[PDB]
């Protein structure tokens, strides 16, 4: 979310009357939220959500298995392939 623990820095900082003005001033420097452009260009986004479920849309602990496919299918072939060569060597 943000650097460090994102959860530790959200409660450290919350709204006061002093603070509210500074939020608007910061926003207005670049202008907007900068979070309306992505919905317009794509006209409804199409993220990486297909590969698995530890992807971009994730709300549970990551498994780290989106950088790599399932090699178990491959292994089924590799195992059998070895048996056949081995047998006549």
């Amino acid at each position: 979310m943000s650097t460090d623990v994102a959860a530790a820095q959200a409660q450290s900082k919350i709204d006061l009357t002093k603070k509210k003005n500074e939020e608007i001033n910061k926003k207005s420097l670049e202008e907007d939220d900068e979070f309306e452009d992505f919905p317009i260009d794509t006209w409804a986004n199409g993220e990486t959500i297909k590969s698995n479920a530890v992807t971009q849309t994730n709300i549970w602990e990551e498994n780290w298995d989106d950088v790599e496919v399932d090699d178990d299918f491959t292994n089924e072939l590799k195992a059998e392939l070895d048996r056949y060569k081995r047998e006549n060597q």
């Binding site: 623990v5 450290s12 602990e61 090699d71 178990d72 089924e76 590799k78």
Partner: protein
């Protein structure tokens, strides 16, 4: 109580197209029989959605794909008619009983027992929302502490039906409050398993093992899945968590598993895998590992999303064990034991090493596999500095905030 999960278990297996041809067509039979007989009518419409891109579909009112690999899937109009009839009927009967309990005072115990029956029907038909409402009135009338705990578990179970992990999680906070109010060890075992299954449903298994190895000894089951089913889940969670010395005690030398034997496929494959990790028969390890993918990980609801992670881990452990006993190996010896090729072996090591649990390098040139050891005082130094780096970050971070105030 009994169809509520058993129909969902088979219906999940039926959804997949990444199962065996044979296993999907066996499941499909149990699901279909139970819709007609038990009046699972609304969840059956729901289930037509849940394929969609996966095959099997052959429904008369709901989408079909071009490839029907199943035919123990049909929508009939009789199902719909039935619904309408049965619905009004059950509703009408109990209502009148509730009014009767109002006229002559009896409504503390009996009206809540009527509303328990209403949520079980609601639950039967696959409505989490309206089951829960009825199970809400049951609370308000003052009943035993035992009854109150039993009800919350039932509601959390309806969370498992739609495979919504958050819906389980939220309800099981409330049981944690009442459990010590009743103070039962009976409904605490149920709690241990209820939680068991919930912890198994999410990524992290560390909690799961602990609850589920215990659930072998003493189990009490009210709307909680079979004892052979619970045994299978426990062997999975044992493997993940524990290493040799501990592992051997817990899940091979349990009296409970040893009296239950193996008679079914699922239990059998998982069990044989576990002894082979201990016993350093690595040959027979990979046939068992492959069996574990098809028959154990994937048809399970609570491991469909953790199947990929579990097998990858398994490959990491077994090779890492071998490495602990070696300083040098050869490429061919190592490959032969597994029953793979040297070329294929280098390839599987080369995904696993960067992330590292193996702690090895490979000299492709001298033809050895060499093993580096950072376990000494060096290891313990690296452990501490990192844990300390975080304490330094947190101290800084809160401190800037108060110094600003």
């Amino acid at each position: 109580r009994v169809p509520n999960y058993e129909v969902s278990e088979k219906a999940f297996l039926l959804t997949q197209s990444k199962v065996s041809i044979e296993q999907r067509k066996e499941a499909a039979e149990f699901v279909l029989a139970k819709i007609k007989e038990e009046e699972m009518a609304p969840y059956y419409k729901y289930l037509c959605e849940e394929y969609l891109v996966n095959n099997g579909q052959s429904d008369l009112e709901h989408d079909e794909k071009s490839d029907s690999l199943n035919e123990w899937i049909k929508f009939d109009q009789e199902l719909y008619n039935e619904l309408c009839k049965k619905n009004e009927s059950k509703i009408k009967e109990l209502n009148e009983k509730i009014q009767k309990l109002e006229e002559d005072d009896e409504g503390e115990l009996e009206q809540a027992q009527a509303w328990i029956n209403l949520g079980e029907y609601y639950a039967q038909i696959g409505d989490k929302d309206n089951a829960e409402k009825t199970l809400g009135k049951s609370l308000s009338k003052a009943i035993s502490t035992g009854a109150k705990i039993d009800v919350m578990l039932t509601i959390a179970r309806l969370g498992f039906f739609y495979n919504d992990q958050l819906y389980v999680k939220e309800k099981l906070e409330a049981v944690n409050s009442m459990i010590e109010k009743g103070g039962d060890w009976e409904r605490r075992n149920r709690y241990k398993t209820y939680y068991g299954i919930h912890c198994l449903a999410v990524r992290n298994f560390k909690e799961a093992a602990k609850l589920l190895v215990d659930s072998l000894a003493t189990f009490t089951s009210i709307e909680l899945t079979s004892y052979e089913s619970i045994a299978t889940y426990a062997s999975v969670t044992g493997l993940f968590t524990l290493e040799r010395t501990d592992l051997k005690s817990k899940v091979i030398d349990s009296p409970e598993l040893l009296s239950l034997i193996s008679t079914t496929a699922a239990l059998q494959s998982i069990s044989s895998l576990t002894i082979s990790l201990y016993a350093s028969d690595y040959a027979s390890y990979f046939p068992y590992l492959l069996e574990t993918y098809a028959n154990v990980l994937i048809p399970c609801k609570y491991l469909n999303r953790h199947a990929d992670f579990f097998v990858r881990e398994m490959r990491r452990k077994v090779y890492a064990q071998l490495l602990e006993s070696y300083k040098t190996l050869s490429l061919k010896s190592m490959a032969s034991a597994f029953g793979v090729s040297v070329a294929f072996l280098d390839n599987d090591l080369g995904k696993f090493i960067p992330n590292k649990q193996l702690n090895c390098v490979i000299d492709r040139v001298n033809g050895i596999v060499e093993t580096n050891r950072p376990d000494n005082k060096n290891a313990q130094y690296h452990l501490l500095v990192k844990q300390g780096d975080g304490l330094l970050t947190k101290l800084q971070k809160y401190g800037a905030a108060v110094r600003l105030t």
